[PDB]
C-alpha cells in the first residue's frame, strides 16, 4: 500500500513560532490528504482535508500545502494548547494509511518544580511492600534529577519515575519518583529524603521525613 513518512518525528518551539511538518507519500496521492491533531488523552480530530481545506472551527493559524507525493502542515503562530501529535493521512487508495506522527511540544520559560515527599501509609506497611513517593510539580524544562536518600546513603536501585505529558495551559510537566522497598528494610531505616536538582533551582531542594 501507500507508505506515509512524516518529518520531523519530534519538535519543540516557543509560543508564536512558525513550525512546519512534512509528509512524503511513496507515490502521488493527488492532494487526497488529511491532517489530524491528537491532544493528550483525546481522540484525533481532523484539521484539514484535500491537503489544504480547513474544517469548520479550525483556527486560521493552521494551513496545508503541497502536491503529488510531498505535503506540509504549517502552524503560523504556535499556541500553548497546540501540544499534540500530528498525523497525515492519505485517502487516495485503500487501505487508508497514516504517517507515523510528529510530536509537538512548547518551549517556555524555566519553572522550578514544587517538591513533595509522601511517606507510606501503614496499610502499605501491613502489606509487605512499601512505596515512598517524591513529586516534582509543574516544572519546565522536562529534565530533572531526583536522588533518594536513606539515613544519608544513596538508594537509586529501587526507584522508578513517571512523567506527565506537557500541560496544555501552562506547558509544564510533573514527575513522580517512587522508591519501593520491603517493610523490614523500610522499618530498619529512620529518615527518608528526596533531593531534586533542576535548572530552576538555585540550590538543590531536599524534602525529608522521620519514620515513626
Amino acid at each position: 500500500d501507500i507508505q506515509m513518512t512524516q518529518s520531523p518525528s519530534s519538535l519543540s518551539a516557543s509560543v508564536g513560532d512558525r513550525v512546519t511538518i512534512t509528509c512524503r507519500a511513496s507515490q502521488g496521492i493527488d492532494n487526497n490528504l488529511s491532517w489530524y491533531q491528537q491532544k493528550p488523552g483525546k481522540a484525533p480530530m481532523r484539521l484539514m482535508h484535500h491537503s489544504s481545506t480547513l474544517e469548520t472551527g479550525v483556527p486560521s493559524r493552521f494551513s496545508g500545502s503541497g502536491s503529488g507525493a510531498d505535503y506540509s502542515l504549517t502552524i503560523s503562530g504556535l499556541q500553548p494548547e497546540d501540544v499534540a501529535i500530528y498525523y497525515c493521512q492519505q485517502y487516495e487508495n485503500f487501505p487508508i494509511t497514516f504517517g507515523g506522527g510528529t510530536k509537538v511540544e512548547i518551549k517556555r520559560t524555566v519553572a522550578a518544580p514544587s517538591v513533595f515527599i509522601f511517606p507510606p501509609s501503614e496499610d502499605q506497611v501491613k502489606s509487605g511492600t512499601v512505596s515512598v513517593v517524591c513529586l516534582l510539580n509543574n516544572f519546565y524544562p522536562r529534565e530533572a534529577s531526583v536522588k533518594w536518600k536513606v539515613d544519608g546513603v544513596l538508594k537509586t536501585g529501587n526507584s522508578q519515575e513517571s512523567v506527565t505529558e506537557q500541560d496544555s495551559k501552562d506547558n509544564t510537566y510533573s514527575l513522580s519518583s517512587t522508591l519501593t522497598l520491603s517493610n523490614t528494610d523500610y522499618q530498619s531505616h529512620n529518615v527518608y529524603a528526596c533531593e531534586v536538582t533542576h535548572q530552576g533551582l538555585s540550590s538543590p531542594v531536599t524534602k525529608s521525613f522521620n519514620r515513626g
Binding site: D30, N32, S34, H49, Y91, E92, F94
Partner: peptide, 8 residues
C-alpha cells in the same frame, strides 16, 4: 479517491 473523498 476513497474514504471521505469517495464519489457516488
Amino acid at each position: 479517491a476513497v474514504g471521505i473523498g469517495a464519489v457516488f
